[PDB]
Design a protein around this ligand. Structure first.
Ligand SMILES: [Mn+2]
Ligand SMILES: [Mn+2]
Length: 117
């Protein structure tokens, strides 16, 4: 089963993302903090990271830089959740804007998670 690490401080958004991903048969890991996301990634090896760029304590883009600096985490695709240029340059594979489109969101994540090994 593929696992998606969701980094989102907002309860409503976290629940929406979790519900949508669970419906697809994916397992999820959850946290509201950028630093914790790094720790969790090293302890549970997620297959994709859904990163809110607008976290209250830190920029998700700075967290993404730390991910790319780690030899074990650099390969994990990161999808930014923003409220394209900056995100792509930051190391994110794609971006999802809010209000999010359910189909666009799922298509984007499946495209990155479901490809021949
Ligand atoms: Mn948020
Ligand atoms: Mn669940």
């Amino acid at each position: 089963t593929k696992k998606v690490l969701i980094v989102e401080d907002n309860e409503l958004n976290m629940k929406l993302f979790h519900d949508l991903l669970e419906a697809q048969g994916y397992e999820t890991l959850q946290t509201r903090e950028g630093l914790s996301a790094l720790s969790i990634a090293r302890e549970n090896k997620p297959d994709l990271i859904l990163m809110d760029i607008q976290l209250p304590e830190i920029s998700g883009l700075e967290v993404t830089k730390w991910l790319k600096e780690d030899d074990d985490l650099a390969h994990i695709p990161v999808v930014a959740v923003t409220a394209e240029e900056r995100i792509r340059e930051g190391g994110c594979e794609a971006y999802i804007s809010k209000p999010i489109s359910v189909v666009h969101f799922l298509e984007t994540i499946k495209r990155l998670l479901e490809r021949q090994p």
